[PDB]
Each structure stands twice: as C-alpha cells, then as structure tokens.
Design a protein around this ligand. Structure first.
Ligand SMILES: [Zn+2]
Ligand SMILES: [Zn+2]
Lengths: 463, 468
C-alpha cells in the first residue's frame, strides 16, 4: 500500500473525503489488489493520526459505493472490479451585440416592460396561497390560470372554450409536437408557402408529409388546398407570417367549410402578433367563426411580454382533448409561479394596460421606421404587409442578390434576414427583386436612422 | 338603408364597435345582400345621430376584415361571402371531458412520491436572487436566449455538477431545460431513429410511455441485487440503456461501482452504444456523501447525463439539463430549429441562486429535514407495525418501498386507502409490460418530504386497515 498524505486544514475537502478519495483512486489504479484487507478502523486511524469517526465515514462511503466489502469477523476488503475495456468546431465563441442594430423579427422589447409590477404580481401570486404552490401541477396547467386565459381570449379574440380544453405551455414548439402526437399519425399536413419554417422543420422531422401551399392576395389558397387535398392546415389568419396579409372573412369561411365538408379535417390557427393592429381593432380569430370544432387555436404571450419568458397555450376540439386524456404521462412545462404570476398580471388589469401602451408605442415605432425608409430609399423600396404586428416586408430595386445584402449588412453590424429563409421548398421562379423581413420589436428609435443608413448599403454595394 | 339601435351608455361598447358588430351581423345573415351598396360615411352618420369619425372607424374595421370592399366612387359595398355549412353542428359540453371536478383535498394525507415540498423553501432568498439577477441583466432577456440556454447559466451548472456529481463537461455540451421529458424527446430525436432502448424493469413508466409512443423498440431489463442486469443487457442487445444508478426508481437499489464498470465497458465494447443516466434525487444521501455520477467514471463519452432540480428546488419550477457526448451535440447543432423552453429570468435567477451559495445551503437544510422526517416515518412505521412491515430501498432520496404480509390484493388496499383519505401509490404502476402484475406480498411505494409530518402518526394509522 502507498501512503495517504492529507491536508489537515481541509477546506479543500473534509478529511474523511480526502481519505475515501485516495482509497478510490488506489482501488481503481489497481495499486490496492482486489480481496486485500484494508487496515481496521482503529488501525488506519492510528496510522493517519485522525479521528476514528473520520476513517469510519470514509470506510462507510467505500462500503456504500461498493469499493469495499465487509466481513463479519472483520476486516474490510477491496471489492473485485473489472478493468476498464477500451471541440474546435464545437465550442461557440462570445461576441457582444455592442453595437449592433437589429431589425430581427424575433426577440422583443426590454426597456418598456413593467418589470416592477410584474414582480408585484409575482409576490402576490406566491403569497396568495404559498402552500398551494406545491399543491397544483396539472399537466394542462393550473385551472385558475387556464380560466383567466380563457376569459381573456373570450374578450380579445372572441375564442369560445372551456378551461378543460386548454393546454399550457412554454412555447408553441412543445404544444405543436404534442398536437402532432394527438392528431392522426398518417395525417397529411399543409403549410403556407412562404411560412414559418421552424414549424415546417418540426413537421418534417416527425416524418410527416407536409404539402406546401401558395398565397394569393387573400392568403392561403383554397384552390391549391382543394387540389393537393391535405388533412390538416397550418395557417396564420390574423397576420400572415412572413408575408403580412390579413386573411379576409371570405377566405376564412372557405377554409371553415372545407374543414366541415369531410370527417377528420383540421385547421391549426397560429396566433402570434394579433393583439397589435394599428389602424383598427384586433380582428376576431378564425376559431370564433367556426361552428364545427375543426379549429385548434394556438396562442402565445411571447410577443406580449416577454423577456425571455415564453408562455403559450392551445385550445383543442373535444375529440383531441379526449385523445389527450388517454395518454397519461404528460407533465406541465411551465413553472407554477410563472402561471400564477401571469394570472395576477391578467386579472389585475396590468396586462391589458401593458398591451395598450405597447400598442401605441409600436405604432409610433413602425411609423418612424417607415418614415426613415421612405426618406433614405424614396420610391426604390416597396413596403409589403398590413399595418399590424411586429414586422413587415421590404423589397428593393437592385440586381444584388439577397446573399450579398445579408453579408454586407453583417459586415456593417446590422442584423437582418432575407425572405428566402421562409421558403419551405426552394423556388426559382425566378430572380429578384430581393426582399427582407423587417422587425421593429427590439429596436431603439434612436437607433432607427443609422439602422436605415446601415441598410441601403447594402442593399446597394457601398451605396 | 339602415336600422340600427345604439346603446350610448357608459357600460356599453364604443359606438363604432356597435356599428361594425351590427353590420357584420346583418351581412353574415344575408339581411344585407352581397354587392349591395352601403350608406356613405356622412349619410349613415347623420342618420344615426352619431359622429362621422365613428362611422369611419366602423367602415375601416369592415374593410380591413373584408366584410366591405371599395371601388373608387361611393363605393362601399357588402362583400360576397359563401354561406356556412349546412353540415351537422357538433354539441357543446361533453360530460366525460367536461369533468374536471374541483374539491379541496387536505386532509387527505399524502404518501405520494410525486413532488414536492412547497414550504420550507427560501422563496425570500429566491426572490432576492431574482431581483439582483434582474438588476444585473435586463437589458439582456429581450434578446432571445441561446437555444441550449444562456451560456453563463450553463457554466454555473457546469461547475456545480463538477463539484457535486463529479460530472466533467463544457458548457457547450449542456442543454436546458424545462423538464426531463422535453429533453428526452429531443434526445430520442438526436439518437438514431432505429435505436433499440432498454429500461429497468420495474422503472420510470413515463419514459417507457414516451419511448413506446415514439415507436421505439424498448426492451425491459430485469433487476438484480446490484441493480440493472448486465447479463440481460447482454442477452437482448440494446443500442441504448436508460438507467438510475444513484437511487434506482422505483426499487431504491444503489448501483455498486462494479456494475457501473460492467455497464461502461459494455458501452465501450461496440460503436454507437449509449447510456442515459437519469439523475433525480442523488443530492439526498443520509448515511453517506452523494455518490459520484456514473458518467464521471466514463472515459469513453458514451454516457448522456440527465440532471434536474425538480427535487430540491420549487415544485413549480421546471428546470432540467442534459450533458451530451460531442457527436450528439453535432447532431443537435444540425437541426437549427430549436427554441429554449426555459424562461431567461428563471435561468438567471438559478445562476444567482447557485453562485450566491444559497442553493447548496438549501440542499443541506432539506437534507437534514428529510433525514429526520424519514427516520421518524420509519420509526412510526416500525411502531404501528411490529411487524408485517418490510422496508426496502437504500437510505437516500425522497421515497422507499414497503412489502406487507397480507391477504388482500394491491388494488384492494389502494381503493381502501382512497376511501381512507390516504393518497398512496402501488408498485404495480412502475412495472412496464406487465401481463398481469406479480401478486405475492404485495408492496407499496412510500414517498415522503411532501408530508407535513403531523400526519405521520395518523397516516401510518390509516395505512393500517388497509392494509388489513
Ligand atoms: Zn370535424
Ligand atoms: Zn462511443
């Protein structure tokens, strides 16, 4: 046996810990042979000049982990262990956002959130019933929260449902996965082209057949839906993503009738930015016009609050809910304190105040942005999309490819995205004009002008 | 052509809203025929004794939603809309689903293994940490956190589990979070689609159900004195194992270092073999220090480490993490479509909670509390049963097992207990497939640590008759 040299100041590690660690390293390195008796508690105690309690703790550690075994009529013996049979690229690097200007449609506003009142609602939610904070984890989410959301969307979106039909949460991705699991396995999905490509990727990764469907001026094509004859539709009726067109009531009715015609047809309504409409009132959801229960309403608080919180919900037709209650193993992905905090934010009226304020603010920001764009680009830029939501589309007159513009803007520390990322299937068909999606969500007004000045070269090389 | 009645009272909707609601109503009912003209703003305004601004707002609404259209003239026309079906309308309600019944429970004493202690948690220090975290960052949180979770948070957790679990990794290998279920799903999507899975029988049945739902081949591995059998794993040749080495769920067996060597070697003996280590209650060990994680003995990078705070921290809080081998990391980075499931503020608060030392402090206090409560529940168990009580499982974690000498079936005792206000779960639940059960004793799983301890006497006393 080799020797145990232990730091007696410990701290570092406790004496017993240093001991059993050395013993582990020694049993593993084979320097202590299997079935070899180690000194008795008192013996090694005397050798190391430490407390018997320490040696005993170490030995109990070994005994529990199975490094040593005990023999009535002692001592303790090394257990018989088998020998072990026999970056750069990965490793992300850190580069700060300072100072980048971001036209990204993702992320969100920070400086304008009522964080203090959010914390007030948090303290309130916790203290309200604290013993009840470990009381309820319901897989669909806490009933009171589902109730508050049901009521809220009853007011705002005209959505009709019971809290029993609602499922929180923690992002639209998890809910969409769950939904693909609740729907028929062989179900043929269909999405808007162009559209939300993360959803397309998620659908294709489950090996689902996803047919792509073009938009006319009215949004999702009912003729192409009729032709390709899919099972479930995935649509963004309020503000179409990326394109930004509001689906008129005629096309909505066309879709609803399509879904009512045959058994087992569904429509997933993805409602993301709908609480913001600058010219008019918020438009009632597709779901509100449905008498047939073919529409699964998905909604999100993600644009509303939300650094970096991510709460979402989906309302299901009864059949799917019944298909859901027969799984049994699901767990709620949202923190209970988060849910209750949300309930407090909604029921105290702070949420709707927030939405009003941010609505005005975003209206102003989009206005100033468009003004800067028209100033810089004059009539060489075309702005597409409704006045609503956190993004719009911009086309430019130039032969410079989208890639050139993206890379040149990258060199300018300007963050933008081209529309090509929203193509589910690649189409050329044909050429330019190149197009960008412009989010104003997290952007400072003071950063607007320079931003638009960092745009325009590219779109034009250097000018 | 107009008939509209307005409610001008304070409690009513704004006049423009009433106007467009009424117009939508009469357009949708065909009372206003398609392509029929609608009154000019001024005409309709004067006729209703109402502002032209309200009328213009209502018309803007109808035009934006598409109930009206405009040719340039006046020039506002009812849009042509298809009639709705005409099919059979489904009903409302539906009592089987309509049944979510609310009745206050306690007491209702709970022996449930499922989470958690709501009290005893420093929510004051948690709120404090959240405060200084929010004051440090923000503006950060508005920038859409890294899909694996915020880097510095993953770093904090990296150091933490290096010290506590002996786990070695780099923050780039870690993926948060929001439960082990989403992480397991993601993992099944990272691992080969045809992968053959092997789980401990008995074991965590939720993972079994998730796997079977995904259409994965899942083999059940018999258990022995040393935990998961290397012999059976050798017989049925799975690609990937799912194991609970520190405290085995349900049975409570701690896997000895020798069986760990066996499993690790098995992982290293052929290519594309994996071990998922589900680590849940490991931070509670009453006799000894927390045993180093299985992956800490792995020299070959074949072990995926699944960690979670869902034991120690808040019952509400859902935060889990996983440590991937670099190949699986590559596979994950090929995807590009993933979004982080955990709130940024919750992550930053977690980081502050760990780095302020409050976390391990809490761990120690809860470790003592649980040590005592378990000792006492055991004492009371061996009191009210001389006896026919058989306690199984190590001294660690939040639960143990109890075999009884009795006639009655497990289902009987469960139903009885239900009528007894006792919430308790059987061992038959954790069994995967599963035929019909076992019979024999039969046995129960006893969770504690959610237990208020004033119930211990009355709870065990309720666990008396039934059982018996
Ligand atoms: Zn239907
Ligand atoms: Zn390998």
């Amino acid at each position: 046996d080799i020797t145990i040299t232990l730091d007696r100041s410990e701290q570092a590690d406790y004496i017993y810990q240093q001991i059993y660690q050395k013993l582990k390293k020694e049993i593993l390195s084979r320097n202590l042979l299997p079935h070899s008796k180690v000194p008795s508690k008192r013996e090694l105690a005397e050798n190391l000049k430490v407390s018997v309690n320490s040696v005993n703790s170490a030995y109990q550690q070994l005994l529990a982990e199975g490094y040593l075994y005990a023999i009535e009529r002692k001592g303790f013996f090394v257990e018989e262990l088998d020998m072990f049979s026999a970056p750069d690229d990965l490793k992300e690097i850190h580069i700060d956002q300072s100072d980048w200007i971001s036209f990204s449609h993702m992320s969100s506003d920070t400086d304008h959130f009522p964080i203090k009142s959010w914390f007030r609602c948090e303290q309130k939610a916790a203290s309200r019933s604290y013993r009840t904070l470990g009381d309820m984890s319901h897989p669909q989410g806490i009933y009171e929260v589902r109730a508050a959301i049901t009521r809220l969307i009853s007011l705002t979106r005209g959505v009709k449902c019971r809290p029993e039909q609602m499922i929180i949460g923690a992002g639209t991705q998890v809910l969409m996965q769950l939904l693909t699991e609740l729907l028929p396995k062989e179900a043929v999905y269909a999405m808007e082209e162009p559209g939300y490509r993360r959803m397309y990727q998620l659908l294709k990764n489950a090996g689902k057949q996803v047919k792509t469907i073009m938009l006319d001026e009215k949004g999702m094509s009912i003729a192409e839906i009729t032709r390709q004859q899919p099972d479930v539709l995935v649509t963004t009726p309020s503000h179409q993503f990326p394109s930004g067109t509001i689906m008129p009531v005629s096309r909505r009715i066309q879709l609803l009738n399509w879904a009512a015609e045959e058994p087992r047809r569904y429509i997933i309504e993805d409602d993301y930015d709908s609480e913001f409409t600058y010219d008019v009132d918020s438009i009632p959801a597709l779901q509100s016009l449905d008498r047939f229960q073919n529409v699964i309403y998905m909604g999100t608080f993600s644009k509303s609050l939300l650094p970096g919180l991510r709460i979402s919900y989906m309302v299901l037709p009864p059949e799917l809910l019944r298909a859901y209650k027969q799984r049994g193993y699901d767990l709620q992905t949202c923190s209970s304190l988060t849910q209750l905090t949300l309930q407090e934010f909604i029921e105290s009226g702070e949420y709707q105040k927030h939405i009003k304020k941010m609505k005005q603010h975003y209206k102003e920001k989009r206005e100033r942005l468009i003004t800067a764009l028209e100033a810089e680009f004059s009539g060489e830029v075309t702005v597409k999309g409704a006045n609503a939501g956190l993004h719009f589309v911009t086309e430019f007159d130039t032969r410079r490819t989208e890639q050139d513009i993206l890379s040149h803007a990258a060199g300018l520390q300007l963050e933008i995205f081209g529309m090509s990322r929203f193509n589910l299937k690649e189409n050329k068909r044909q050429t330019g004009r190149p197009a960008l999606i412009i989010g104003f969500a997290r952007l400072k007004e003071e950063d607007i002008q320079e931003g638009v000045q960092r745009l325009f070269k590219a779109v034009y090389g250097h000018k």
